[PDB]
Amino acid sequence: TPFEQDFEKDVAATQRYFDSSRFAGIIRLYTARQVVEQRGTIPVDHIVAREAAGAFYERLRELFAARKSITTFGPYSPGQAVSMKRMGIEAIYLGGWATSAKGSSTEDPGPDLASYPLSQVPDDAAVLVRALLTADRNQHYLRLQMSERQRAATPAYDFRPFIIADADTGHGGDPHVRNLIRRFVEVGVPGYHIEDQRPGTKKCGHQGGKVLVPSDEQIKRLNAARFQLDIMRVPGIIVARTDAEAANLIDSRADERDQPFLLGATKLDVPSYKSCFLAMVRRFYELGVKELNGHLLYALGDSEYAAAGGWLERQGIFGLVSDAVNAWREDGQQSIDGIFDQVESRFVAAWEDDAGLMTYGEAVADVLEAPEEWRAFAARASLHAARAKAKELGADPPWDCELAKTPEGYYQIRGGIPYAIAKSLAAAPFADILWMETKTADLADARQFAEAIHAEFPDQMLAYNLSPSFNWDTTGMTDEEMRRFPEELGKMGFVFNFITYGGHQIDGVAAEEFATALRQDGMLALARLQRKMRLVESPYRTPQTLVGGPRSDAALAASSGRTATTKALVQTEVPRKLLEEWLAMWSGHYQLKDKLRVQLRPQRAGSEVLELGIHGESDDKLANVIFQPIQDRRGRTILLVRDQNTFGAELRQKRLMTLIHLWLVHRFKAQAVHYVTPTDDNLYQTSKMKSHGIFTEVNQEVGEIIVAEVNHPRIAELLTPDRVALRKLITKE
Amino acid sequence: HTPFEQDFEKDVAATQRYFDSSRFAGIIRLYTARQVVEQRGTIPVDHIVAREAAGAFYERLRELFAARKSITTFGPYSPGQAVSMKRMGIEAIYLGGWATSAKGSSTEDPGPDLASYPLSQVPDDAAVLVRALLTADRNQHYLRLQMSERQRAATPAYDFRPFIIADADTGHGGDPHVRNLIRRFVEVGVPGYHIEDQRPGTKGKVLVPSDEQIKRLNAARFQLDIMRVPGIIVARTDAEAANLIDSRADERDQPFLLGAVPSYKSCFLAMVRRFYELGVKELNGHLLYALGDSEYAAAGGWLERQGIFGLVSDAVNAWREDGQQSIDGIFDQVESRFVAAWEDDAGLMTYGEAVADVMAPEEWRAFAARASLHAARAKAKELGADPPWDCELAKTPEGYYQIRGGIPYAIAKSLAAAPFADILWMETKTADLADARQFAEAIHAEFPDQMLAYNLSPSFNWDTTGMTDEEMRRFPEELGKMGFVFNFITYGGHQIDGVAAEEFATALRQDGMLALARLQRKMRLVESPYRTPQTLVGGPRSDAALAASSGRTATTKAMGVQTEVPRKLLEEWLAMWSGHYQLKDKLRVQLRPQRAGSEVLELGIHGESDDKLANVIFQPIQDRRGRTILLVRDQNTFGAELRQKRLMTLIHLWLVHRFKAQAVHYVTPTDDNLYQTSKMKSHGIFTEVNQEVGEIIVAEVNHPRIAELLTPDRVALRKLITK
Amino acid sequence: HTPFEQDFEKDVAATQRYFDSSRFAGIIRLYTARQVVEQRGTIPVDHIVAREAAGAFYERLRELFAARKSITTFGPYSPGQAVSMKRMGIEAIYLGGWATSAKGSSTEDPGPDLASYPLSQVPDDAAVLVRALLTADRNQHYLRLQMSERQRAATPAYDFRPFIIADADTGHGGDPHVRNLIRRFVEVGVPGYHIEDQRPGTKKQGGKVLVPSDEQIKRLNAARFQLDIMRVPGIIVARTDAEAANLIDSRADERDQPFLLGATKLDVPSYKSCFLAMVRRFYELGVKELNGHLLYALGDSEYA
Ligand SMILES: CC(=O)SCCNC(=O)CCNC(=O)[C@H](O)C(C)(C)COP(=O)(O)OP(=O)(O)OC[C@H]1O[C@@H](n2cnc3c(N)ncnc32)[C@H](O)[C@@H]1OP(=O)(O)O
Ligand SMILES: CC(=O)SCCNC(=O)CCNC(=O)[C@H](O)C(C)(C)COP(=O)(O)OP(=O)(O)OC[C@H]1O[C@@H](n2cnc3c(N)ncnc32)[C@H](O)[C@@H]1OP(=O)(O)O
C-alpha cells in the first residue's frame, strides 16, 4: 500500500543515514524503524542545525587530521559572539556557568548549580544564533551594494552557528535529555555536551562532594540524545564529558566499570561513617546546641548509635565535641558554623585513618606480600570477579565499601585521570567528542588522557576546557609556553578548546574600567573609547550600521513603495592618506610602480604600543616602525621607538624612514624621539637626520638609547601644503 | 455606613492624602482618588521593590537638583555591568530601547532601534538588572554578616538599590498599551520610565499632538497610582530634530505648522509615475494611492514648468547608461531637487511668518507663538491682514503635516508636558551646553523646580566638537549646574562590550593563553571581584543554603606560588623606615593605574588618615628583546620633613624588583630629580646616570647591589635605611 | 559573472517565478524580487510547516470557492479543542485576539479585547495549537504503524495539518511591527493572518477609529514582503471595520473623502470647543472631578 511504501522508504533512507561514515564506530541501542515511528507524517526541517552540524563536524575532523584545533571562549552577549567571528574564530562555546551568572527575567543570577529550567541555556543559545544569522543577512545586504573590486577588497566574515552548548547532566532521565536536545536543535545549535554527574548535587567552595552517576546512566543520556537528533534528521555533535578526574563520590555501585574504583574499609570492626557522623551531631544536640539537629533527618537505631558512640569516645571525638560546646558557651552561644567545621574535619580524618580506606585491588595487593599481574586484572574486573580471583589465589582480605558510604548513601571512589579514562572509554562508542574536565592547565595530564583514549580509539576527537579562574601565573610557565599551550593541545588531538566563561570576565573588566573612567574623566572617557575604535577601524565606530540600519531602510522602502518621507567634516586625526600621498611621490621619483598602503594598528590587541607598516600591492610589509607615544607630566609628547625596518636593502638610504618619521611626528605632535637599544644603522640614520635639520640635537649612549629633539621650524616647513620643501627632501636637492 | 462603604471611603481618603503629598506638587491628574480605588479590587498587592526605590530615587534626584549636581551614567548591556557600575559608585542606571533592540532575545532577531519588539521586551531586560542588583545585595549582606565589626568598618558596602529609568518608547499605542507597559515595569521593580512624543513605527521624524503625549503621561500616572508606586515619569520631546506631525488638531502645535501651486503629495506621486512610465518598473509607489486624473494633470503641469520632468528624463537616461542597476542613488538626487523646487515656489512658512510679511512686528510674533490657527486668523483679519496660507497643501503622501522643528518647539512641547511629568528631556544628537542652556532656562523661567535629563549619544564624535580634554571632563558637571540631574550615555554598555570582545578574541588568536594570563594580571592589579568569580556570583551564600536544606548532612569533605612581588614587602620596608625616623604612622602601599585602563601606573604611600605622603607616576616599557625600562613622569615626597631620608629610594628598590627593570628614565626632570638620582648612584643603586638637564635622566640599574639589598636577612637594607 | 553574482541572479530569477506564479494572480507588490533577495542573507532557513500548510490551505479554499462551498469553524480555547475539531472533521481553525485577551498569560492579566498585549501574544497562543496538531499527527501515525492493513482500512485517519488563520489585529504599529508580527506567526507554523483597518489602542457603541486606506494597504504589503522573504505563500486576510465605524484619524486619503461628514451651518462653533466649554462649566460650578479641559490649551475667543 502507499502507506507501507512511504514507511519502508523512510526506514531505508534512515538506515543509509545510520550507516554513513559520519557515524562510523558509533553504537545505537535502537533501529531505523524505531526512529521513523516517532516522526509522524507532516514534514519538519531543522535546516540551520542540520547544515551547521554537517559543516562543523567535517571541519573538526579536518583539524583533527592536521593535529590543529579551534581555541575559543564563551560569549556573554550576541555582540561578543558576532565579534569573535569577525576576528576569525571559527566556533563558539556556550556554558551553564555564564547562563547561571546572567540569569533571566524570572531566574535570579547565581552559582553554576544547573538549577535553572532546562530551557535556560537553549534560550541563551537562541539569541546567539539569531545574532549570527542577522549578522550574515546584514553583511550580505551591504556586499550586494558593493562592486566586484570592492567585494574582493573588503573581507566577508563567516557567521555560521558552529556552537557547542552545555546540556549539563541532561536535567533528568531520557525524556529530559530528548526535550533538552530538541530545544537546542529547534533554535539551531549543532553541538551539545553532557557530563556524568548526578543532577542538583554540585557544591561551591569545597574540594569535596562531587557525585558521579554509573556509566550505564551516562551512556543512556548520550544514546537518548542521539535518538532525538536522529528523529530530527540532525547529525548533531555529541560531546561526552567526565568529571571523574576530581570526583570523590558515586550514587550507585551497580555498574561493573566503576567497581574497580570503589573505596572500602579494611578494618571492619569500625562502625559506618554514617552512624559515626550522626552520633557526633546528636552529641552536639544533646549537649544543648539545638541548631545542629541534622540527625532528625534519619531514623537510626539505638544499636548503631551505641556502636558509633563507642568509637567516637575511643578516638576522642566526643572529647572535641565537649571542648567545642564549652567554647560555644564561653563566646556566648553565637554561630556554631566555624566550631562545628573544626570538629567535622578532625572527625573525617580520624574515621578515614582508622578505617583503612582503599580499593579492593589495593587490599588484595597488600595480602600478596605476581603484583603487577593482579593490578591489571583488578583494574578491569567487577567486584564479584575480583573476589573470585582472589579467593582462588588464597587471598580474602576484609573489605566493605558499604561502611564508607556517606549519609545520603553515595559510595566513595578513587577520582583521578585513570578513572576519567575508564569512563571516557565506555562512552567513546556513543560520543563524537570526549572531554576530561580539568581544573589545572597541564599538558602532561592532557597527554595521559589523550594517549590512553587514542591507544584504543585513534580517531576519537577530544576537547579541553580552560578555567578562567585558574591562575596561569602560578604554573611557572614562560609567556612563550602560555602562547603555545593551545597549539600543544591541538597536537594531542584536542580539536575544540574553550575558555568557558571568558565573556563574563571581559564584560566585567570593561564595565569596571568605563564606570571608573566616567567618574574620573567625564565625557573624555567616551572620547578615548571612540579614539580607540577609530584606530582599529571597529564596526562599533558606526553602531547604526552594525545593528543593520542599511538593510532596515531597504525594508521600509519596500514596505512603503518608496513613499515614506526621508526629506526635511572636521578632522580628528592626521590621516594615513597624507603619508600614502608622500609615498606616491617617493615611489614616483625612484620609479618603483608599487602602490604603497599605510597601516597603523596596535602591535598586539589593546596595546599602547603601535605598529605603522608600509604594505605593497602583494600585501608584503616593505617597512615598519614599532613605537609608542608617551606624555610627560605637562602633556608634552615623546615618540618611543623600540624597532624600525626598511626590510628591502634596495629601498634603504632613500629617506623612506624619514618620510614615516615626518608623518609620525606630525600625527602625534612629538617634541622628541627616543630609540631604545639602537643598532648601528640607527646611529647612522639619526645622525644624518640631524644634518637634514629634522632634529636640532641628537644624544646617543651607544647601544642603549638615542634621544633626538625635533626641529619644529623644519617640520612646519616640510608640511607646507605646496610640498616644495618636501619634494626637495625626497629627491635630495 | 456598611463595612463595604467604610473600607472604600478609607482607601479613597488614603489615596487622596497620597495625591496631595508634596511628592506630586504641581502635578495635574485628569482623574480622582475614587477612580483609582475602583480599579484596585479587594485582594491586597504590594510592589514594594518599585515603591521603595521610587521614593528614595526621587528624593535623591531632588537633593542633587537643589545642590546643582547630577548623576552621570550609562546603559549596562548585562546584569554584571549594572552591578559593576554600582560598585564603582554610580548612583543610578539607565536602560534604553536601542541596546534592547541590538541584543534581541530568543524570539526577537537583533536589529535597529525601531521599537518594533513586543512592549514586554524592555521590562524583560530590566527584570534581569533588578534581579542582579537584589542578588548582589543578598550576597554582600551574607558575607558582611560573617565579618567582625572592625572588618565591616574596613571593607566598603556598595549600594545595590534598583535606581533605574527605563525606556517606555512611545507607549506602544494608546492608554491600554501605556498602562500595560508601565505595569510590566513596576511588577519587575523599575521605579522610572521615559515616554517620547513620537508616532510609533515611523523611526522623517513624526511627532504626535501634545494632547496625545499628555494622555500617555496621565495614563502612566494613573497606572502607577493604582499600584501605589510614586514612579518617576520622564517626558521626552523629539521636537528639536522633527519635521513632521501626524495631526494639526492640538492648538499648541499649530504655531509651528508650515503652510504654502499643486499639493506636495500630487507633485511627488506624478514624479514617481513619470519614472515608472519612462520604464523604471521598480518605482511603482504611485499604485499605493488612487489619485484623480485632475490632480495628476495639475501636478504634471507644475513638474513640467519647473523642469523636474526634465531631471527625470536625464536621470532615467543615466540609469540606462550605467546599465539598469539600483535607482536608489539617482532617485534621491531628483527628489532633493524636487523638494527644494516645491518648497521654494510654494512659499513655505508658518502662519505667524506669513502675517508678519503683510500692532508692532514683535507684538505679533509673541501673539502668534501662543495662538491657535483660528485665534491667529481672527486677530489678523481684525488687523486687516489676511495672507494666503494652506498647510494641507504641504502634507506628505502619508498625510503628515510639516512643522518647524527646533529648540523653540521642544520648549513648547516640554512646557505643555511639565505639569504631567517629573523630569523633562529634550532629545539631542549634538553635545552642546548652549543648546542645553536655551532649553533649561526657558523651562526654569516658568517651572524653577522642574528637574531635567540630558542624553549623550555614544555615536556623537566628541573629537569634532573642538573642545579641550578639560572641557570634556567638565561637561557632565556643567549639565548638573543647569538642573539636568540625570545624564546618560544611552548604549554605552553595548559599545564597551564590543571593544572588549574584539580585543580578547584578537588577543587569544595572537598570544594564545597569555591573553587570559594578561586579563588575570589586570584583575589582580585593580583587585577586581572578578578575580574570585565563584564568590562574585554568590557561592558562599549558596553553600549556606545547601547546609540549611540538608541539615548539614550533605557531604562536602573528601577522603583519599607568588605571581607578583607583593605591596606588603614595601610596607614592611616602610615599617623599618617609619621606625628609624620614629614616625607613629603605619604606611600603606597602593599601586593602581593612574586613570582607568591606563598602562601608566601610580604607586602611592598613604598614612593612617589616607593622606598621600609620597607617590610615583611611572609606566613600564619593553624594548624589542623584552628588556624592561621604568619610565618615570612624576615623583613626590610631599612632606618636606620626610625628604632626604631615602623614602623614594626604598620605593625605587621595590619598583625595580617588582618590574625587573634594567634602567629608569625620568622625563622632564626637576632639580630635586637631578640631586636624587645622582646620590642614588653613590649608594650603588645605579651603575651609570646620564642627565640632559631639564629633558631626561637615564639611570642604569646595578643588579648586584639590588640582589644584595633584597637578601631576606635585610642586613644591607637596614644599613641603607639608617645611613 | 562571479559565483557571488550568479547565486544572486539565480535567486532573483527563482523569486521572480514565484511572484509570477498563478498563486499571486491579481496581487500587486510595491517592491521587486531583488528587494526580497537582499533581505535573505546567505545561511539557508526553511519555515516548512507554514510553507506547506499555506500551499494546501490556499488550494483547498480556492477549490471550495469554485464549488460555492465553505468551511464553518470556531476559535479553539485550548490545544485539545483544536485537535478535537479536526477529529470531528472541521478542515480549518480560526484564532482570535478576543480569546487571547480573555485568557491572558503568565505576565498578562486577562481582560477585554483592546489588543494591548505584546504583539507576540497571539503567535505564542498559535504555537501551542500547531504543536498540538503536529503531536496529534505523530501519535496517530505511530498507532497506525502498529495496525494491520485491514485495521487501517477500518479505523479513520484524521487530518491534523495546521490550517490556521490567526489575528494580527491592526499590525501593532508600522511596517517593522507588521513584519515582526508576521515573522513570529510564520516561525511557529501559522499559514494565515488577518489585519484590520483600525487605529491601534483606540478600541472601546461608537468611538470606532479607522485609518486611511494607504496605511492599511502598506500593512498588507509589509506582510506580503515578510512572507516573500521567508518563502511562505501565506494567506493574507484584509478586514474592514468600516461597516460600524464613525471616526477616521486622517482625511488625507482620497478614497475615504467621499464618506467624510461635515457641518453645513458654518456659524456653529467647533464640536471640540463646545465639548470643552461644557466640561469647563461643570468645573467652574464646582465639580472638580471633571477637569478634562486642562488637557487642552483652548483660547478665550473659542471658549466665548
Ligand atoms: C629602532 C631601534 O631601536 S632598532 C634599530 C632599527 N632597525 C634596524 O637596525 C634594522 C636594520 N636597519 C634598517 O632597516 C634601516 O637601515 C633603518 C630602519 C635603520 C633606516 O631605514 P632607511 O630607509 O635606510 O632610513 P632613511 O633612508 O630615512 O635614512 C635617513 C638618512 O640616514 C642615512 N642612512 C641610513 N642608514 C644608513 C647607513 N647604514 N649608513 C649611512 N647612512 C645611512 C640615509 O642615507 C639618509 O641620509 P641621506 O639621504 O642624506 O643619505
Ligand atoms: C620625577 C620627574 O620626572 S620630575 C618630578 C620631581 N618631583 C619634585 O620635584 C617634587 C618635589 N621633590 C621631591 O619630592 C623629591 O624630588 C623626591 C621626589 C626625589 C623625593 O625626595 P626623597 O624622598 O628625599 O628622595 P630620596 O631621599 O630617596 O633621595 C635619594 C638621595 O638623594 C638625596 N636628595 C634628595 N633630595 C635632595 C636635594 N634637594 N638635595 C640634595 N640631595 C637630595 C637624598 O638625601 C638621598 O641621599 P642621601 O640620603 O645619601 O643624602
From Swiss-Prot, chain C:
Sections of the chain in a coiled coil: none
Induction: Induced by palmitate, acetate and glucose. Repressed by succinate.
Disruption phenotype: Deletion of icl2 has a little effect on replication in media containing glycerol, glucose, short-chain fatty acids or long-chain fatty acids. Cells lacking icl2 have no discernible impact on the kinetics of M.tuberculosis growth and persistence. However deletion of both icl1 and icl2 eliminates growth on fatty acids but has little effect on use of carbohydrates. Cells lacking both genes are incapable of growth in mice and are rapidly eliminated from the lungs and spleen.
Residue positions binding Mg(2+): 167
UniProt: substrate binding residues: 96-98, 239
Family: Belongs to the isocitrate lyase/PEP mutase superfamily. Isocitrate lyase family.
Described function: Involved in the persistence and virulence of M.tuberculosis. Catalyzes the reversible formation of succinate and glyoxylate from isocitrate, a key step of the glyoxylate cycle, which operates as an anaplerotic route for replenishing the tricarboxylic acid cycle during growth on fatty acid substrates.
Name of the featured protein: Isocitrate lyase 2
Organism: Mycobacterium tuberculosis (strain CDC 1551 / Oshkosh)
Gene: icl2
